[PDB]
């Protein structure tokens, strides 16, 4: 078989139909495929699959820790479910619908019970493919929910049950974040079925997957059930309008008979619908079409190959990969912070990159060139004393390790984190002397190898080496009375050590120091010049550059267009000219023997001959370094997992030499504690790295090309697999996630401490403490873990931010020049959909807190005996008192208690200082009871139980738990309240117990009941309906169906898309469902003649 679209060869028509799907051609099957590449000059396709698959058979790997962005849901886009609380059964006059002979039962859309309530249960009716596994599941209030408010810092509590009031805000923020995370899904389009039930004739109902979908019809579409009987539910149904049900609108575009998208009326909550709409918008903004992929890869290839990705016209081909430069910069900053001066972290990257260069370059290292050029044996020479033999001994040409050279090349890409130097061992032993033939070769090797290092202080070391070797023969003045000429060369490591006798040539006397003057002039004049080079595809891939323009790559060496026919002895090339200058200098040093007394024989001839052979050695390394190597670096750099991070090279200018690199977490308008990052503690700009000069010199002198090299063919072969195994796109997605997570972290953590970050606050009424560094650190840890599990991450994400004081405001990175000028780069932070959705959830929670099991306000403890059935949640006004009520007593932290003697009533201290007895109406902050729970509990219980003492406890917000009871019997609540008061703990508080009378649909008698705890404001928003199956409620709390929730059904004039956020959520509204295609990355690599 054959696929003409991509010229691939297959074997199965089924596999042919599967493969044409990646070409946009539907079936007219290995979704594991991530990328599919194929060459044009050979038969060798390459595919990539996820690293977690258990069958790597003839496939490459994708080791990037990519997140899971696209996930689908076929269930109901709802998170609130109605649950019965007190079951009830009542007789009915109509039992079942009747057709010709068969009959069908009646299925109500709502529970048929005495009372029912709304409970939060994320994805309780969903049907997902991949699970975010961050569900928030509440329990009905008749049960205990205390454990959902103590997952956070409540570690060393004094009670297993109960929560710490100082961390409700932290726990609630974490809960809201999980609520947002668990709903990040795409509404999948599914099948339908035309209905002909008389109440909903002609509707197009949506059908859930799995067996027996129609069991869900009663839940989805309330109007489907008729109006058989007289009851709350039947009246509610009679209120609704018929037409708004089932399918509402559909796309014009369709494949086969399946519409592309559809709009449907179905049961759902507005909150999650809005959240998923925002998620859809965010993903849609990242779409990419394959043509710009062609552009990006072609430009990225530096014009050595051309890429083509044919495709068919479509609009639902979603390939989310486009992000902004700011997110890439933020992610790069995070990656840099991850290092933390850990050499073990950085070493593998450099080693692997060096190996990759070694295995892709046409250059070959061959010391036999050196050996043949020297052509010296000198057998049986006990005292050789010959320059050729000594230089061969130093070079040690036969040995082949050359990791130093490739690592030196690789270091250029990471100038900003690691600095390459020459190990101090390579320097002459004990400084050395010009009188030694041994030390001359060390100087030669070191001088010839220095320029390739990234050390900014290399030229000073090069000069100071010869200055050290010349002590006693040739003297120069020292500016500093401390530092002498004999100061070791390898110590001049920082710009502040540069001698003025070197900066200003004129201070070197040509009479007192001819050779030093010449050497200084040579260094000034012929030291290599840095340059620049373009790379990458900024218009599509963005750029992670920070201190450089986005599309440029810095080099310490000038570069030229590639041309193989270049002459070897082209002195225009900077490296060759440098070698020639060094050789000529050593020559001029050695002719007259002014500096080598104690040589018995005139070694001038042999010395000069060896220097000439080295000067004119016809190696091809400088050619490669000037032409080919920059091209290879440009090709590789965009593909790397760690994008390049450079700091500008200045050849000899001193005052602009960089010396320090730091990271900042605070904004520019805050005066805070100076907390420098660890990276600033390095003596050099980056982590020191030592190289071997000998290997670099051997590489520079023993380079050659294959005798049949053709650049086009070689580089096409090199690029094809490297790009076939690319991982850029996963990196882009991860970077977007990282920026999102950082913004979410700052936004949340700003709401539990004092940070001058300008952000609206809506959970201030929730009590909490003032978070310190450790508390914020633990909270940030929980946030980080939640996010990592949400998107199925396993590698680093926000870990470097947790080192110290996570009370941050904004990322920023900067570096410093020697002359004090600093460059500060602050990425332009874009929006964050997750943080905005969390804020919206906070808005809603500020009105719908009862659905989450939180009660707002205060409570009043006091005996009340009566037969009325007013619910505790909504007490009559004439039972409560506030701070602004005549005759009340307010209390502060000073609340000393004095026993009265000889029958005098015991007394307690008012806030104003007056002394009052145990009766009346009081106000306590809850902390006061927490301070002395045992003492107050011992002192007050009798008066509260039998006397006339009532206390209002200032709480702000608190969890609550209900205890339904039959009003027809006697009922005393003293036991529950006493138990609650006993378990008050300096670090914990149990949920507040409330007693509520069960509503009745028929006349009943009443019996006395005794309460002790009532709320201070309305808290029954969670109540849905009472006695739903009966015509009306006779006694007890009464509540009809909350019509305003079903606005689009009950309000005839409401437009279909209207919502009532953020004060009321709707339980029935319009939902859009899609069905997209996510084809793999397809490419065809073509060669360039």
């Amino acid at each position: 078989y054959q696929c003409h679209v991509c010229s691939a060869v297959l074997f199965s028509p089924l596999d042919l139909d599967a493969h044409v799907a990646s070409h946009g051609l539907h079936g007219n099957d290995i979704q594991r495929h991530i990328t599919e590449f194929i060459s044009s000059w050979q038969n060798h396709p390459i595919v990539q699959v996820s690293a977690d698959v258990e069958n790597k058979k003839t496939a490459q790997l994708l080791h990037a820790d990519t997140p899971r962005l696209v996930t689908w849901d076929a269930g109901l886009c709802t998170s609130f479910k109605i649950v019965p609380i007190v079951p009830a059964q009542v007789p009915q006059d109509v039992l079942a619908y009747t057709f010709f002979t068969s009959s069908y039962a009646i299925q109500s859309p709502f529970p048929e019970a005495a009372v029912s309530r709304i409970v939060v249960h994320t994805r309780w009716a969903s049907n997902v493919d991949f699970d975010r596994d961050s569900s928030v599941i509440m329990a009905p209030p008749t049960e205990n929910n205390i454990h959902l408010f103590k997952q956070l810092l409540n570690t060393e509590t004094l009670s297993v049950r109960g929560a710490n009031p100082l961390m409700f805000r932290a726990n609630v923020l974490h809960m809201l974040l999980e609520f947002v995370l668990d709903n990040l899904y795409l509404n999948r389009h599914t099948g339908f079925s035309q209905d002909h039930t008389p109440f909903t004739e002609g509707a197009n109902l949506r059908s859930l997957p799995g067996p027996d979908a129609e069991k869900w019809y009663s839940i989805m579409y309330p109007t489907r059930m008729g109006t058989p009987n007289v009851s709350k539910i039947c009246n509610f149904v009679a209120s609704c309008v018929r037409n708004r049900v089932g399918r509402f609108d559909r796309a014009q575009m369709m494949n086969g008979a399946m519409s592309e998208w559809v709009d449907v009326f179905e049961t759902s909550d507005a909150l999650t619908v809005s959240i998923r709409g925002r998620w859809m918008a965010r993903l849609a903004r990242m779409n990419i079409n394959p043509t710009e992929i062609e552009w990006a890869l072609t430009e990225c290839a530096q014009g050595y190959v051309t890429v083509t990705s044919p495709y068919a016209p479509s609009v639902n081909r979603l390939m989310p990969y486009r992000i902004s430069n700011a997110e890439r910069q933020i992610s790069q900053i995070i990656r840099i912070m991850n290092i933390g001066n850990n050499a073990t972290v950085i070493q593998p990257v450099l080693q692997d990159i060096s190996v990759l260069l070694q295995r892709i370059s046409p250059l070959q290292i061959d010391p036999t060139i050196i050996s043949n050029t020297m052509s010296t044996v000198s057998e049986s020479t006990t005292q050789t004393l010959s320059p050729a033999s000594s230089i061969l001994g130093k070079l040690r040409p036969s040995n082949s390790d050359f990791s130093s050279f490739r690592v030196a090349l690789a270091g250029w890409l990471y100038n900003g984190v690691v600095t390459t130097v020459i190990d101090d061992s390579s320097y002459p032993k004990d400084g050395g002397s010009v009188t030694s033939l041994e030390n001359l070769w060390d100087f030669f090797i070191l001088a010839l190898a220095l320029p390739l290092t990234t050390d900014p202080c290399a030229p000073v070391k090069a000069f100071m080496t010869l200055a050290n070797m010349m002590v006693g023969f040739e003297t120069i003045p020292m500016d500093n009375q401390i530092y002498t000429q004999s100061r070791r060369a390898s110590a001049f490591s920082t710009p502040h050590t540069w001698p003025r006798c070197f900066m200003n040539i004129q201070l070197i006397s040509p009479i007192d120091a001819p050779i030093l003057r010449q050497w200084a002039e040579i260094i000034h004049r012929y030291w290599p010049n840095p340059s620049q080079i373009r790379y990458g595809a900024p218009n599509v891939f963005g750029s992670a550059n920070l201190f450089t323009p986005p599309e440029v790559l810095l080099l310490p060496i000038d570069h030229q267009p590639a041309n193989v026919t270049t002459p070897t002895l082209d002195f225009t090339n900077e490296l060759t000219n440098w070698r020639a200058r060094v050789c000529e200098l050593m020559k001029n040093l050695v002719d007259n023997q002014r500096y080598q007394p104690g040589w018995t024989q005139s070694l001038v001839s042999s010395m000069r001959g060896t220097l000439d052979k080295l000067k004119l050695i016809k190696s091809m390394t400088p050619m490669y370094l000037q032409q080919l190597a920059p091209v290879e670096l440009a090709v590789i750099a965009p593909m790397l997992p760690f994008p390049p991070f450079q700091v500008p090279y200045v050849r000899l200018d001193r005052d602009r030499v960089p010396t320090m690199v730091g990271v900042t977490r605070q904004s520019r308008d805050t005066i805070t504690q100076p907390a420098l990052s660890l990276s600033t503690t390095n003596t050099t700009v980056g982590v020191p790295l030592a190289l071997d000069a000998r290997a670099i010199t051997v590489a520079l002198l023993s380079g050659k090309y294959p005798p049949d090299l053709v650049t086009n063919v070689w580089y096409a072969d090199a690029i094809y697999p490297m790009y076939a195994d690319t991982e850029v796109f996963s990196n882009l997605q991860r970077d977007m996630i990282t920026c999102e997570a950082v913004q979410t972290l700052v936004t949340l953590v700003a709401q539990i401490s004092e940070t001058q970050y300008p952000v609206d606050r809506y959970l201030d009424w929730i009590p909490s403490l003032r978070a310190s560094a450790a508390t914020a650190a633990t909270f940030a840890e929980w946030v980080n873990t939640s996010m990592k599990t949400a998107f199925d991450l396993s590698d680093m994400l926000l870990e470097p931010l947790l080192s110290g004081d996570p009370r941050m405001t904004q990322l920023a990175i900067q570096y410093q020049q020697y002359n004090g000028r600093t460059f500060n780069i602050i990425p332009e932070m874009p929006g964050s959909v997750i943080a905005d959705c969390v804020q919206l959830t906070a808005e809603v929670f500020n009105h719908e807190y009862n659905l989450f099991g939180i009660a707002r306000g205060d409570i009043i403890i006091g005996r009340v005996q009566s037969t009325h059935l007013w619910s505790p949640l909504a007490p009559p006004p004439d039972l409560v008192f506030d701070r602004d009520t005549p005759g009340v007593h307010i209390f502060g932290r000073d609340c000393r208690i004095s026993f009265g003697m000889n029958g005098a009533a015991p007394m307690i201290r008012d806030e104003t200082g007056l002394m009052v007895p145990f009766e009346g109406n009081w106000i306590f902050p809850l902390a006061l009871w927490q301070m002395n729970t045992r003492y107050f509990n011992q002192q007050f219980d009798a008066w509260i139980k039998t006397g006339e003492l009532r206390i209002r406890i200032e709480m702000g917000a608190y969890p609550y738990m209900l205890h339904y009871y039959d009003p027809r019997q006697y009922a005393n609540a003293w036991n529950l309240t006493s138990a609650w008061l006993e378990e008050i703990t300096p670090t914990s508080i149990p949920s507040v117990p409330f007693m509520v009378p069960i509503s009745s649909d028929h006349d009943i008698s009443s019996a006395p009941a005794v309460q002790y705890i009532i709320s201070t404001e309305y808290n029954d928003r969670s109540l849905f309906c009472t006695n739903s199956s009966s015509p009306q409620t006779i006694a007890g709390p009464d509540k009809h169906i909350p019509v305003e929730r079903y606005n689009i059904l009950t309000n005839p004039d409401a437009p279909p898309t209207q919502i009532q956020l953020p004060e009321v959520v709707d339980l029935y509204n319009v939902v859009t469902r899609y069905a997209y295609e996510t084809p793999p990355i397809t490419a065809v690599v073509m060669g360039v003649p």
């Binding site: 290997a695 599990t789 110290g804």
Partner: protein
């Protein structure tokens, strides 16, 4: 319907057209497998660095060592690993014992917490220590 398992634990007519014959007479240069093996190593993301950060309980992770000592030890580990990859007894490229006097270098370790205090006693231990010094019990 389809489902995808997670990789991390969670909360819980003739047809032979005349151009399809194969003459695999071309050998790539450089070889495909050779380049693939090299780029496989470069694919791998950099290792995580959890040390010095708090855990689920609130106690920081790491070992109780001086920061400078930790940085030096990490440098030695890097040099040893570098020697290991090059199949040599002594690494030609060393991250330790260089010319530079990097005596002020610091590395993140588990010795110090976020408050700047010492981790001689874990965070949770100190919190329990403090909070239990204030509790009161039932009267005699």
């Amino acid at each position: 319907m389809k489902r995808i398992p997670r990789k991390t634990k969670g909360k819980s007519p003739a047809t032979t057209e005349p151009g399809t014959s194969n003459r695999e007479q071309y050998k790539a240069r450089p070889g495909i497998a050779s380049v693939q093996r090299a780029t496989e190593s470069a694919e791998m993301p950099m290792k995580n660095n959890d040390e010095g950060t708090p855990d689920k309980k609130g106690n920081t992770k790491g070992d109780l060592v001086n920061e400078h000592s930790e940085a030096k030890d990490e440098a030695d580990e890097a040099t040893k690993k570098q020697a290991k990859d090059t199949d040599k007894s002594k690494a030609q490229v060393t991250y330790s014992d260089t010319g530079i006097n990097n005596a002020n270098e610091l590395s993140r370790s588990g010795n110090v917490d976020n408050e700047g205090g010492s981790n001689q006693k874990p965070m949770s231990t100190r919190i329990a220590e403090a909070t239990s010094a204030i509790v009161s019990k039932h009267p005699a």
